[model samples]
Target: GVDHCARHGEKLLLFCQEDSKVICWLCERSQEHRGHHTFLMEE
Candidate 1:
């Protein structure tokens, strides 16, 4: 099972550097975000 956000209970935001995909934070700070800018989900 995957962990959810403490506040929203929703998946966090993940910025992908390879594919540049905006995903969940759980997936950020990884190789995918090696040189990408990651932050919370915004409008």
Candidate 2:
């Protein structure tokens, strides 16, 4: 099986929040950025 998430940033997706660090959607839903807070990238 192939996981785009991992390829995104080391088995993750690429979000706009952490410009310097691009993580996958799964990562966003993970505990890593749990209390890191989030910002609106589009709306």
* Model 2 lDDT tens row, 1-43: 2234444443433454544565656667777777654543331
Give the per-residue lDDT of model 1 (tens digit) for 4-29: 65644656454455665556655554
TM-score of each: 0.36, 0.38
| Cα shift from native, residue 36, model 1 (Å) | 0.4
Error of 1 at 26 (Å): 2.0
- lDDT for each candidate structure: 0.55, 0.51
Clashing pairs in 2: 5-11, 5-12, 6-11, 6-12, 12-24, 13-23, 13-24
Q: Rate residue 24 of model 2 by lDDT.
A: 59
